[PDB]
Design a protein around this ligand. Sequence first.
Ligand SMILES: *[C@@H]1O[C@H](CO)[C@@H](O[C@@H]2O[C@H](CO)[C@@H](O)[C@H](O)[C@H]2NC(C)=O)[C@H](O)[C@H]1NC(C)=O
Ligand SMILES: *[C@@H]1O[C@H](CO)[C@@H](O[C@@H]2O[C@H](CO)[C@@H](O)[C@H](O)[C@H]2NC(C)=O)[C@H](O)[C@H]1NC(C)=O
Ligand SMILES: *[C@@H]1O[C@H](CO)[C@@H](O[C@@H]2O[C@H](CO)[C@@H](O)[C@H](O)[C@H]2NC(C)=O)[C@H](O)[C@H]1NC(C)=O
Ligand SMILES: COc1cc(OC)c(NC(=O)Nc2cc(C)on2)cc1Cl
Ligand SMILES: COc1cc(OC)c(NC(=O)Nc2cc(C)on2)cc1Cl
Ligand SMILES: COc1cc(OC)c(NC(=O)Nc2cc(C)on2)cc1Cl
Ligand SMILES: Clc1ccc([C@H]2C[C@@H]3CC[C@H]2N3)cn1
Ligand SMILES: [Ca+2]
Lengths: 376, 377, 378, 378, 377
Amino acid sequence: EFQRKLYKELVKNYNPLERPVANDSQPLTVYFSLSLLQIMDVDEKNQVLTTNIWLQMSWTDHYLQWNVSEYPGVKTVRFPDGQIWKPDILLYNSADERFDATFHTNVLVNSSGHCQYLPPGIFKSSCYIDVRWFPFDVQHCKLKFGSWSYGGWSLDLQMQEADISGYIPNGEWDLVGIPGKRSERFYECCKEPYPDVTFTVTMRRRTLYYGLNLLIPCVLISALALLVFLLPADSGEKISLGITVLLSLTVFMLLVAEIMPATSDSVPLIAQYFASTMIIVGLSVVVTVIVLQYHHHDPDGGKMPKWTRVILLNWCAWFLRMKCQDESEAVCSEWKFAACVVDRLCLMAFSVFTIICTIGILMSAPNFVEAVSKDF
Amino acid sequence: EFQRKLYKELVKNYNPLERPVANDSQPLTVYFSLSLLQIMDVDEKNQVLTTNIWLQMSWTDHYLQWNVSEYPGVKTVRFPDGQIWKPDILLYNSADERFDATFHTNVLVNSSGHCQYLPPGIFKSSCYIDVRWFPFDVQHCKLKFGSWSYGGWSLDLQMQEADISGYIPNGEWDLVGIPGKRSERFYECCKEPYPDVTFTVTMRRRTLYYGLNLLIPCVLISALALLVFLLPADSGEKISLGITVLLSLTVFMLLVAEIMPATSDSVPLIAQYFASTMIIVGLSVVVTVIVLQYHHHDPDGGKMPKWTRVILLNWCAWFLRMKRCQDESEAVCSEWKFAACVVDRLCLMAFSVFTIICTIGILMSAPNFVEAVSKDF
Amino acid sequence: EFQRKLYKELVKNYNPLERPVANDSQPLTVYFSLSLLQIMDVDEKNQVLTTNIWLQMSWTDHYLQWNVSEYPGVKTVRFPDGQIWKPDILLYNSADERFDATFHTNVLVNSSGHCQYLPPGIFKSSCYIDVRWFPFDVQHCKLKFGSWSYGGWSLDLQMQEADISGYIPNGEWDLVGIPGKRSERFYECCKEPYPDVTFTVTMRRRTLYYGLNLLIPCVLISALALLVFLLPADSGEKISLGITVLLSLTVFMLLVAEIMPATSDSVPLIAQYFASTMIIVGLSVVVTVIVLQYHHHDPDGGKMPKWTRVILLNWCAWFLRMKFRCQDESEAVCSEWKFAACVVDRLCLMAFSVFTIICTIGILMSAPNFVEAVSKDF
Amino acid sequence: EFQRKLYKELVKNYNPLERPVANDSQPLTVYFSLSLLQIMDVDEKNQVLTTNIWLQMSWTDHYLQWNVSEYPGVKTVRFPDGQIWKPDILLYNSADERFDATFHTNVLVNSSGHCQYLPPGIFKSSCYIDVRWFPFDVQHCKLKFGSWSYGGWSLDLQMQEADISGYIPNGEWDLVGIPGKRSERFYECCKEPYPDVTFTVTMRRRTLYYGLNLLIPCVLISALALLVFLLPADSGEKISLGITVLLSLTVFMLLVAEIMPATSDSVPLIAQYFASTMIIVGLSVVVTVIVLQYHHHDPDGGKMPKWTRVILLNWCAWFLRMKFRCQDESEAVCSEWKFAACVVDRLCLMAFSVFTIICTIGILMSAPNFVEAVSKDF
Amino acid sequence: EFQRKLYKELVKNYNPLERPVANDSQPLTVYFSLSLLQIMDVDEKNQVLTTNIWLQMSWTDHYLQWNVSEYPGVKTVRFPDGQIWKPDILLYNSADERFDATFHTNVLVNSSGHCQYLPPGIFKSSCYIDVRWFPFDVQHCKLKFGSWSYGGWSLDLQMQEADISGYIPNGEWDLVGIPGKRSERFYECCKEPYPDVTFTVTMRRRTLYYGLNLLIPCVLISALALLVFLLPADSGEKISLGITVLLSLTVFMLLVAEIMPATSDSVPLIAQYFASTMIIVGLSVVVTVIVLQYHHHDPDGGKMPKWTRVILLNWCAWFLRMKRCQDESEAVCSEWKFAACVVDRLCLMAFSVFTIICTIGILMSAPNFVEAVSKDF
Ligand SMILES: *[C@@H]1O[C@H](CO)[C@@H](O[C@@H]2O[C@H](CO)[C@@H](O)[C@H](O)[C@H]2NC(C)=O)[C@H](O)[C@H]1NC(C)=O
Ligand SMILES: *[C@@H]1O[C@H](CO)[C@@H](O[C@@H]2O[C@H](CO)[C@@H](O)[C@H](O)[C@H]2NC(C)=O)[C@H](O)[C@H]1NC(C)=O
Ligand SMILES: *[C@@H]1O[C@H](CO)[C@@H](O[C@@H]2O[C@H](CO)[C@@H](O)[C@H](O)[C@H]2NC(C)=O)[C@H](O)[C@H]1NC(C)=O
Ligand SMILES: COc1cc(OC)c(NC(=O)Nc2cc(C)on2)cc1Cl
Ligand SMILES: COc1cc(OC)c(NC(=O)Nc2cc(C)on2)cc1Cl
Ligand SMILES: COc1cc(OC)c(NC(=O)Nc2cc(C)on2)cc1Cl
Ligand SMILES: Clc1ccc([C@H]2C[C@@H]3CC[C@H]2N3)cn1
Ligand SMILES: [Ca+2]
């Protein structure tokens, strides 16, 4: 009864186009915030952020005010889309094909006129993904909200603190905070300024997944390449093993390309690590070819260079604690012994290069210590 | 004739925004329940569940009532979307881009006023998929339903037991049940509490499919890797079998990556088993290098360390029941080759024992393993 | 002049909510059928069927009746969606995200009130795909249609024979028929019964494409695997060829997995055949290591067990028609070992050849529709 | 001042359902045509064609007529969807999920009543893609247009010659023409005839892209397969090279599988080329194993059959212009056996070179459109 | 108060179909422009350009004029889609499935009637992507805008300079400018001419990403292929190394195929470079077979043709500074291996030079190479 009567009275002469102020000259205060429920996906290749968001827009309709003593029990009303004035707060940097992914729901008003509007939505935002440090990367993705067609003299946008009470963790991202800021900006279209609210979603990538799936396997497959320097040359599989492992590491670079965006702002840390390891494996291929040339040397070819006969069979040989047809066998054994010395020297040197480059590149990430401590 | 008169009478002064109650102060009892017709696809990369649900919302419209003695033969009327007050019971954890996968259908009513509204839809829900024990894992997926803008004082939501009579099996998931629960929660937006009905769809993965596409194949490829220890070394193909088989085993991890989500909450059992297999095969390659180093040992090189000369050619050799300058060099080479043969067999047995243990000990660490294997096969 | 008058006259007091009967108590007969124009795709992985369908729903509106003598030349009228009552017959087992893929068009009524409504649509239906017999599979995909909110006491649904005259073939699927059936089922929501019309689209997969792109290439590549027993061991490439072929046959399994659903209701025939082929090639590599192990046996090692010396160098040798001094003796003992290694190649050449022939033939002819397949599409 | 009055005047008693004819009995002449702007993609796997089309429907509304002397300066008016009667001309064989991809725009009327309506749209049409001759194929894709609910007695559809002046080239397809035809067919639903206008888009695939991406690389990888007969046997990599190149060729059959539809109407030409190439390389591996069997032949076994000793070491050896004591005698027999490996290598090198040449030319020039193709695209 | 009065007054007799001019005979000037905020995606395979655009359409409504002295504080009004006449300026060369990706927003009018309309949108346009010079390529994508149904005699379209102040860089594309041009074209449909405004978005591709993912790795993998000529033949892995690296170079051609459109207008520079690389590696395999044929020459076979005995063992050998029956047989076999080694060394220089030329020569055959190398590295 009273609900029917009140609904009939509240729509007499009501125009959903009129801004609901008592004094037309004064701006209308709109309190804006959001509740972030989940970060569903961050597809870095297209530079878009998908979030489950409950935007919270509250304002006051001067006309939707009733005296509850005259409408007993009726303390709130609800109006669907198109029947009540609403703030046209859009996401400026939207990436959704429709550009406005908000789902239009009811506006709950009470007896005093305070309007509460809590549209749910899946919002896609064009976020610049700083991939410099991936997988140890921290992203600051902005969600910029503002009235599309109302300036400061008409819609006085005000900020309320973001809600994360109902947030459900993701698995891949540690929300470090959603600090917000209210700005008063001027635009090259118009003279009246337009205020905006920008929420900076700060998220730290949890590195266990990519860590176990890319870094640890890469390290140990690069380690399978370093076994070539312990394999004997007579096996006739040095080049096979070495080249096969190198061409196997290409799969990791392919996967990164499937994940990463095609941006030239910087070179990804994962990319530098894959590049450094794979170039070192290629150098292992070059050096084993040299070992095989020393090993398979025609005895009646060139003589042993004195430089080599001392730099390998005297110094390096001692450092590592190694130590007519039959004269040629001695000669070839000497050439084969030189091949053995090169194997051990480069084994040690390439082992250290692997150790340094791996540790040196990974600790250049600011977030490395935080990462290893929180995620392992 | 009477249908026209009824439809004309029932819309007079009707407002689709007025809760259809007689006493405004009392909440309106709405009964809610769903019907899971099919689980078409549970997405595990985007942590999204997909279902073919037919919701059920029954209430009582105080305004849409008539005396059948006046309107012969019109015992029921139907109203489309936007003409009758309808409960705004949305899914809270929706993953659909429109957020509302409900298809708006008619609202049947009878001569007493009891509305009945069953909307169909392909509901997508953001469900946390516990992948810790995958493929032997019970996902527990919540579908939380509630009126978006009505609190407890206005819409008294009540739960009815879920219907699964028409449920159509899936093939991949054995529905273990869909228990529901009614909650009264408070929100940081508002003071009036809001009740919600949450249906937890509990799903058991049928493991035969993965069983034969990934795990048993991986076991057999790992045995194929294990064959390197039976190859004679003179073939010159030990390392090519080892490394080639390892590279073939990498596709299984690629597949599991293509299915799994990029989550750090846990390490899937499939991942731990695949990783242990990869580590065992890589260690087989390292040991392959060691055996080839012993086999190709220069006769005029280092001497056999007594620790080796006993630990390999005396104890391990007996346990397994094995037993001129060029001739002496061949004799040393012949010894070293015996050491190469002994290492192959010891590591054959040892890697055989680690394969059976690791596989059984990782797979039988899943609580649902027995239920699964006993029923899925 | 008269079409305008008729259109104005027919909407006087008309309500698109009223079911158009003269006697409210009697149900309204609705004749339901469809014209199947094309089966666009059957994505078996998702268990969905995409079809081009022109549902044919005809009924009688009591109120849309005029006397053509008073409206000369105006013999039919047309009304768009939302202006006249039309039966809300949906596809119950729909798999489309919107759940209702029907495209709403006009309703052609004539002077006697008979309404004809033939909406086109791209329909996705959740069809259980029996993948046991793939590629030689026959599917029975159900399209279940019924009025959502009208029971038998209100809308007397009647079936008309399915139309396939204008059906345009697909390329992969042989429509075996679209037999229909009217059923009266009870539901756990309600007491009034609900009738439905179920069209079972029966489809035979045309086997030439997959059979050329999966089955035959596996046969020939697996035959290449069994050929290792003609390669000599001294080549030093038996293991390379054998393992390379086995690892190459895995890509077919990747494609088969990319196509098929993730179901445990039964094991597909394509998979049992590939698995049986794959294990035979794997066993061939197992035999390969044994051949190279008997060959590369230390001449001064263990002696040939008499049991081996007979099973290989005496009996099997006849059936298949085969037939410094320390170094010479060492070559001699090694020489019998090489021949023993050679006999295993030939025995296992014959034996594994038979396994593939039996395995392949015995698994393929266990499909009921196999003879139809080879006879119709080859 | 006058545009407001005209718009106010023209909507008095106007009903957008009424066909705008003066005599209801006479059909309404509608002139239909289209402007083809671009062929964005034809995804043959799903058998659908994506085109940018601006359909051109022009007719005469009897009611939207004004005298320009009374409304000076107001010479044309525009009406959006739902306010003016429009022809419901749909694409019968549509493959779009919505089934109607036309974008609804204004209807430009002038003072004489002639309505001009040019809705743009991206149209998906279910087109039969003849993949028999691919990549040297020509397609005939139908765009079938007709009034959905108006027959010949009410809407007399008429064809106008299609416009391609503004056509934007594609890159992959040479528009050979869009000849149209008006047909009047009877349907199994209804008695009143229905006219339709069918545009057969004739498209020739430009073969430079696939000819360099698939044909030439396959030729060259098959040439590396033929190189096995020039490798010495002692290298121990003949089988490695041959099998490696075969598994390299497998990706091309994967690529066509990703491109081509899974239809069994025929075997695509590219598939027939790849199949013949793979068979030739596999047979080359077979012969490679036979040569290795001859090369690694023990000299204590069987003696060389006379047939072999002539067919290889006498005739074929002459035509192609090649030409401790126990160890030497065995080396002589081993040397004789190794010579046989060289003869087979050389004979089969020439023979497998020729069958690649024949197979290549005989399959490529079996397409009628091949010569025109190579002449236009290379 | 005054806002509601003004809204009531402005909608009396207003028709959103009427073009809002005082004199019907004179065309209505509409100023058109756009603000390009981002180039979201260039999927060249579909020949489509995805951009974030805020089209700017400004005109004057003759009827939406009020005196602010009579409506104090009410200086602007806003009207949603369907309530006021708007210019139907569409993107002619649209590739979006709905064909109109504009998001309909309010039209901000002031007291003098000037209407300001700035709709946002994700715009897909069918743009011819000249892949001739890829990755060092510059694209000129046209966005053609015009009123669909209003010709020059009714809607006098005028262009305003494009806004890029708020443009946010992309990462892969350097916006070189968006020059516009206003045209008056005649169409085969109609007699009244129709003006359009065409914005040519000019984009220079950033080459660091592709430079480091495909060009440099291809060079280094082809160099790895060139190592075959330093490998000794007795290793028995020349053919293995060469052929394996060639199948590895095929992934790059597959990647380019995944990227590039299916166009025959020209051959992309990347494709020509990869093709030359593949020909060099394949010719290296062919000559590798020849050297192995030289090395595995039966000593009792043919004799060395004098041509060979000079061109390899005298000139080329000196240029590169190289220098009983079984004894004779090994001696002749020793020369064949020496001939085999000489061919390897010549091929090392020659194929190195071919590698040097093709790589350097083909890459600077792109006009934009210097611009790229200077800006992108
Ligand atoms: C209508 O709702 C508004 C907002 O929820 C109420 O205003 C709040 O009242 C509480 C009670 O003292 C204050 O603590 C808040 O600061 C107020 N907020 C605002 C924005 O005004 C208002 O009281 C409600 N009206 C009635 C009649 O209860
Ligand atoms: C209106 O259309 C209906 C259906 O097309 C017509 O009913 C059919 O008429 C034919 C002609 O004799 C009969 O053979 C069929 O059996 C009728 N069908 C049914 C279901 O009764 C009807 O005659 C048409 N009315 C007019 C005035 O032409
Ligand atoms: C309504 O807005 C228009 C444009 O925003 C105003 O016209 C501009 O006025 C300024 C100041 O005189 C000039 O510099 C511009 O050149 C004008 N632009 C155009 C397109 O004419 C107009 O003055 C505003 N109306 C009122 C009442 O202030
Ligand atoms: C391509 O090659 C690989 C790819 C991989 O995934 C993307 C992984 N992944 C992996 O090792 N994941 C693990 C290990 C453990 C323990 O837990 N997760 C490995 C290889 Cl080799
Ligand atoms: C890549 O390598 C494999 C991949 C596989 O799928 C993902 C399978 N799958 C498999 O064998 N599936 C079967 C077997 C039987 C019987 O039924 N289904 C095997 C390998 Cl080796
Ligand atoms: C992975 O390896 C293959 C894959 C293939 O496709 C998926 C095919 N396909 C094929 O042979 N298709 C043919 C042959 C003829 C004649 O016609 N179509 C072959 C191989 Cl080897
Ligand atoms: Cl009603 C009508 C009349 C004309 C047009 C056309 C004229 C120009 C070119 C395409 C479009 N704009 C489109 N619609
Ligand atoms: Ca991500």
